[PDB]
Amino acid sequence: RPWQILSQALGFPNYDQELWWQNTAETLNRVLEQCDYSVHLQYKYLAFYHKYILPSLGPFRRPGVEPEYISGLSHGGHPLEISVKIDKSKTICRLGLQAIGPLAGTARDPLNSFGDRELLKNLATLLPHVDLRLFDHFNAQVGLDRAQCAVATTKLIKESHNIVCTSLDLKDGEVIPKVYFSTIPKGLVTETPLFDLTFAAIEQMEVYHKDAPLRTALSSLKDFLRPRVPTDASITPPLTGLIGVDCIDPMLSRLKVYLATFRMDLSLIRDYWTLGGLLTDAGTMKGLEMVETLAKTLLPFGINYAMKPGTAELAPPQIYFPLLGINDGFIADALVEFFQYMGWEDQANRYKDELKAKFPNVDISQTKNVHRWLGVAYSETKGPSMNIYYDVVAGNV
Amino acid sequence: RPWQILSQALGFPNYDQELWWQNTAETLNRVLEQCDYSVHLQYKYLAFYHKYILPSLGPFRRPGVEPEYISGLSHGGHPLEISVKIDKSKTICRLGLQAIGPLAGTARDPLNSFGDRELLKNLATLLPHVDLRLFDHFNAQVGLDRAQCAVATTKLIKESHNIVCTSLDLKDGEVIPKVYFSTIPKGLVTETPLFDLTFAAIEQMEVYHKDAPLRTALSSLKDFLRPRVPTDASITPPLTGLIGVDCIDPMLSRLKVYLATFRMDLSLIRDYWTLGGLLTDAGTMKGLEMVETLAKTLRLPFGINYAMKPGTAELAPPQIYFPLLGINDGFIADALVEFFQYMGWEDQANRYKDELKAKFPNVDISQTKNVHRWLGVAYSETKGPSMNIYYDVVAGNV
Amino acid sequence: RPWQILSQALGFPNYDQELWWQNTAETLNRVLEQCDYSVHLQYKYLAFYHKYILPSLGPFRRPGVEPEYISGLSHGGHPLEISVKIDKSKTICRLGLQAIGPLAGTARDPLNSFGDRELLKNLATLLPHVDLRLFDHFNAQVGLDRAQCAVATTKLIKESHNIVCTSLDLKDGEVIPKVYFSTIPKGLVTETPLFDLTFAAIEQMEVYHKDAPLRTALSSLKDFLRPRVPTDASITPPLTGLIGVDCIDPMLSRLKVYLATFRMDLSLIRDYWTLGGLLTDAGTMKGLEMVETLAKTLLPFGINYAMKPGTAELAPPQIYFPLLGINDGFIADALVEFFQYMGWEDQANRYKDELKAKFPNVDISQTKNVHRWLGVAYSETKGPSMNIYYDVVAGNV
Amino acid sequence: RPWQILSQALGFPNYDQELWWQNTAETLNRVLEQCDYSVHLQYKYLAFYHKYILPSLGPFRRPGVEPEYISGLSHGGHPLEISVKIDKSKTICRLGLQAIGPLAGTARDPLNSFGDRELLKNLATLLPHVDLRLFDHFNAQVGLDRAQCAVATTKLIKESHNIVCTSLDLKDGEVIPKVYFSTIPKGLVTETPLFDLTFAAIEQMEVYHKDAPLRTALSSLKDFLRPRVPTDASITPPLTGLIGVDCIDPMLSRLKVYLATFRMDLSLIRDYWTLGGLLTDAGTMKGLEMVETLAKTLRLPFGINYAMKPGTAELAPPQIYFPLLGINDGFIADALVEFFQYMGWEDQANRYKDELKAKFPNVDISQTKNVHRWLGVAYSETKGPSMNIYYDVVAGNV
């Protein structure tokens, strides 16, 4: 199998990398097989993962070895998730990580401020269409100096000592990077409202200055958000907690504004999904029915508003449900049910057996940490989709 | 001597780093001695240089070995300069380089777009006061993607295939980084006027949005520049060719707008120095007299660098850079002696020549015309007059 | 194709590595395909080649860039050859290289004394059955200190400033390393006879002390060689110029003693092949007829005497014919003829078309440097075989 | 101070290297000062240490972070010691380490078989007189393949999962490497007597084949050892546990055979020191009196190290190593003062305690029992008496 062949051919520079491979790569290869990637792409993505991602992952937290940097991306503190994005017809695999610098979580780098960009630089000489300009824009607007990073660490739990996260879509035959910047450290240290910071960073983008439609969409979103998030500097959910961009040509990149909140019920889902009554069309409502059904059939909730240059009008957000603490066999049975409801019979009929085969070392009827998040979306052009995020290390140990 | 001891202690990871050391470090150690740095700071800076700068300099261009990336920073194509900044009371040493990535000047990195930031990241875990926000801001506004970088290379000579360069001030026992971003590649690829792209990038700075005084100073500079630099997309002089920032807290960083031009005479000097009559105070006029005198005493373009600080509403006189490539270095030394006497810096005058010879022991500097590359002169209200002398260190050694 | 997929997935740390890949890896992948390696082994070997060999190859000599170290392994000074070993039924691909240290050919490393062992160390943590003890034994007996290496360089042409060479057999599904140590630098600097040095280094092996049969074989070989190679310190071919070992368990390793000479004619072939009349059996003679025929149908000639612990009796050597300067289309037509004579009809019928497909950038009817060496062997148990060494860079530029 | 300046100039590639520096370099700089190394040599050695030794030390074992490889070189499992060698006229500093590979103590490298050679290769391009031939010889004779290394790990406690270690003498402004190869893993895996495997490896040396005098000295040592060490395959004392060489021209290298044993009293000391009566000369007897006196003034095994040089036919007295782990370090300091007075080294006696406290400022050395780990004593016909004091530097700092 590719993951075994690459281990034979490449070995490992060090033991943490070897332990990362032994705890993730068989799962990754399985996901790729299940999603119908050809063998040549399996090799491509696994070889890429070996060379670029393994060294980015830092030490492998395990009994007796407590790293200096502890990630919020997973239950055991490992800076890695693997996700799938499921349509009617097809499934795409994606990696989410934090790239860990070698002084991360110590005085010289308290918020792991440098590793992700270093990874992106290696990707920019690897891949012709990687563009770092929006990364650099937002790193400039929300990043902090060393002293400020140290102040932020005294105000934040260990699992939130970060400023950026990276995801890599393994799509078509390419690697497509996207990043998310956190607003909280800058809000805490500057005592500036999260809302003001978020929109000020956005309004200073080059593309915002050139694109009237984006400015119109952003003004509707600010109207919607202003009354719903804090006006003061407090970290009171609901709040504008992340800004996401795609590492592509800025005029093509989707700009994402992510809300985090700890309350969700039907009223709130409806409010978020329709932007308080702004969106009342049939596509929107069909999406809403999906999301309501999913909630009935079934960490903060997330709401992600995505905007593109050239589009004046806002769409429904993607909504993220946290699943940590809920039985993974229950979740699987629920998703089978939801897939049937969506008419995705094939996905329903394979979901549970494929889930087990992804995570052979664990008994999913006994685990509660393997499914970590579920995202749901509905797009006027693309259709409905569902994003499932897995704590791959929890699924392997 | 420190440069020799460090060569013995540390060796070299490869032969290009060894050649960079054998052509630069003895000079650098000399400069630091001549500037009255203590032995401990000589070690600090030479060890820093070995660890951080040698790998950043890439291959050492030499007969039989042509790198893929050729720098415009020096005559022989070497991405390094060493400068001194001279006052009444003190002299400080500065390094200027381009950090060369390992695929620089090839399809995967046509304009060497990544090495300087990588160096800066390493400096940010080394030094507590290094700040990358303004670097990242301007890299975002004036940097180009790979395909654009490839287009730019078809429109620029090999020595101008760059977007950024870095200087490191070796001051107060610290290393203070500053960078300069080139506007030309973006201007060429986007067919936008240099003046428009320069000020649009500046106007999107976070600090510009928060600081009324900086906006006001910028606004006076634009009024001065707009009728003097092109309004079209042409690359013709005087032009806004570089944006400089200091890699420190954005609220403390000096923002620089550098003009390049070929034409200079006393009336242009006055125009640049006084911003066409805007500045008429005694300090300004005393400065002007100094700069005129230097010009009389004395091909690359002239430079004119307008430096602005958040919290300051008013423009000061720029620093003026005289290009010295092609002029005999013994003449330049005699000219500087003369100028130092005129400023009343007798001690600097009496040591300049002997010190120059001792900086460059492997070459006869009276026979060279490329060792002195630039001379910058400045006057400050609070700080006094200063002179910046930029040396092509490799031309001084090979 | 694997070589293209790996280039997409891995990129290159630097431009010399990229140029090595662009001048060799398509050829390598072609060789592996032609030899019926499965796709999974093609990936294994090409990924291995990317990770381990590319950085070992040093700079890529090209117009305007003259490295400090110039290899004798190829016509353009590149430290690389690809060879095939052909039987009746099957063909095996092998890599020959010098691993170039980053100070090679300069005062701090005048004879490139360190790179090969550094490569072997990385292989010893990659591959479970790699054994370095014989490497270290011979490096101890024939290696030189810095001053001695500098003296040797004043007495040797630039293309012979080396002490070790490495080959990697890509066999079964493994990588099997072998090395060759040169005796000449130590002979020159110490003014010791090459014969004395060679046998003294051998007689100090641990396995020689434990294995009576090897000592008996070695005593017959010394009897045969003593009158034929110099008794003085001169570098007068015929001479004992290399010692070869396999980097495996010393009790399994073949020990090789390689003679170089500039004269070969029928008398001498017969003398070398039969060890001056010692070997007169039917297998030996059948081998001799092969070798004579090959010579008629068609750098020093080489003669390689291989011995194994547990075997008291010497076998016929492998004989190496240099082909540099001879037309590569002529060579191909000759080999087709020789293959037919051996009854290897299938090999004959595909040789020329496969050769062209290995080296598509060149016209083999116009080149004289692509075939560099040919080795012929006959083994009592294994049968006849032929080793063809290609200047892969000459075949690509 | 140099250790601080280098930390400022160089920083650290990772947090384990930073912790190694923060627990060792201040001590090391102190030792070098105390030994009257000039500031330039202090820089030379501390910069060398930063570049070459810090990466070789692997992870810094500490609460919450357990490495895969645990060294027997120190009490806390840290692969580092610092020693001083004291004469009448001078004191020199030595580093002892294991160079830890990145897969050490795991399936791909169970006995850390590659790191020390890799360090030595880097030293061989750094320093002109470093020679790897004897290293490679003994690595060939006593080193093991992966499967054998895995077998050995099942028969040895974690702290003895090693085959080699390295010392670096910081002498004459140079770095002089030496190594010690363990015989036990080969003895265990092959079930061969340690005595037989030790001498078979020695007897295959190129220099042994060329040097009649060394063979003769070896022959006298074997006669002495054969009735004292086991004839069977057992790992019981006194045993031939290490072979030491200097990484120099084989014809100049001292070959060492190190015995380990637990039992010592005055009659055993005499036996080891005189080789059971073989040596009876005045120098030898004067040495013996010294060593007896030290023993009276004063768990790891005792060591006895027999050092032989090509061209010398006759055996000299060994160096004897007293194990000091578990004994109070204030007592040891008082004992050494007493011994120094007895040797007539008044100045060394008068400074020993104060200097010890200044070497280890972060710990109260009067409360510790692991900081002094070994004390070696030697007498040489030509050179005089000497004392080697080995410190667990990390135990002196944490």
Ligand SMILES: CC(C)=CCC/C(C)=C/CSP(=O)(O)OP(=O)(O)O
């Ligand atoms: C770890 C935190 C803060 C939230 C977990 C959920 C998460 C990382 C959503 C990322 S948005 P994304 O995966 O990029 O959604 P798509 O546009 O790729 O479909």
Ligand SMILES: CC(C)=CCC/C(C)=C/CSP(=O)(O)OP(=O)(O)O
């Ligand atoms: C314009 C071209 C071709 C190269 C750049 C010229 C150059 C080295 C400008 C340096 S300005 P700088 O050294 O930063 O002067 P200060 O403001 O530090 O006094």
Ligand SMILES: CC(C)=CCC/C(C)=C/CSP(=O)(O)OP(=O)(O)O
């Ligand atoms: C470059 C020089 C000195 C000779 C060229 C021929 C050469 C390298 C023969 C190697 S012997 P080898 O390839 O290992 O023969 P096999 O036992 O592998 O069949």
Ligand SMILES: CC(C)=CCC/C(C)=C/CSP(=O)(O)OP(=O)(O)O
């Ligand atoms: C025997 C065990 C458990 C560890 C080795 C003990 C050790 C550090 C011996 C060093 S002998 P050494 O420092 O080389 O003495 P010198 O001959 O240099 O005077």
